[PDB]
């Protein structure tokens, strides 16, 4: 019953890297900034990244956070990580959005590495 906890809300344009066209592209197929959360399932101590388009709340990312996720703070406003399939990118609206998300990601990883 206990709904998942949102532990941050950042503004980012969610992106994926398109290998066949060797460039970054918008996740879900369309441009626009999303509201991006880290959700914490307090029952199980599992976490996921969920990003919903600001204009229409389309879910463009729904990504589990594993123990040992390598979180790459590539630029001050662009962070990325990968799984076996994709590289995900977050293009933040500002340095504050980015730092707030990164802190929540490290907190998630803190709990996951306990």
């Amino acid at each position: 019953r206990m709904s998942e906890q949102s532990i941050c809300q950042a503004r980012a344009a969610v992106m994926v890297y398109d290998d066949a066209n060797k460039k970054w592209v918008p996740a879900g197929g369309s441009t626009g900034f999303s509201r991006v959360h880290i959700y914490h399932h307090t029952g199980n101590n599992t976490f996921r990244v969920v990003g919903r388009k600001i204009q229409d709340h389309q879910v463009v990312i729904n990504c589990a956070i594993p123990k040992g996720l390598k979180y790459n703070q590539a630029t001050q406003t662009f962070h990325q990580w990968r799984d076996a399939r994709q590289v995900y990118g977050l293009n933040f609206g500002s340095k504050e959005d980015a730092n707030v998300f990164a802190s929540a990601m490290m907190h998630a990883l803190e709990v996951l590495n306990s």
Binding site: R11, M15, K23, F33, I54, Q55, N91, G93, S94
Partner: protein, 64 residues
């Protein structure tokens, strides 16, 4: 050699581009867009906030 704030890909060093602070966007592809509603803002009224731009006061407040 600069990276686009809209699409996160390289901007050709030679071409002209949209600039605001240490942010740049492609001026030829649809990169300079309202962060909310994706409206093209080239030649248009715009409202910049760090790495984001609007469009209008309605799109801006939607992203507060």
């Amino acid at each position: 050699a600069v990276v686009c704030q809209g699409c996160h890909n390289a901007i050709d060093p030679e071409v002209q581009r949209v600039t605001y602070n240490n942010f740049s966007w492609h001026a030829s592809t649809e990169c300079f867009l309202c962060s909310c509603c994706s409206k093209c803002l080239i030649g248009q009224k715009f409202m910049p906030v760090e790495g984001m731009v609007f469009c209008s006061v309605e799109c801006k407040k939607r992203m507060s």
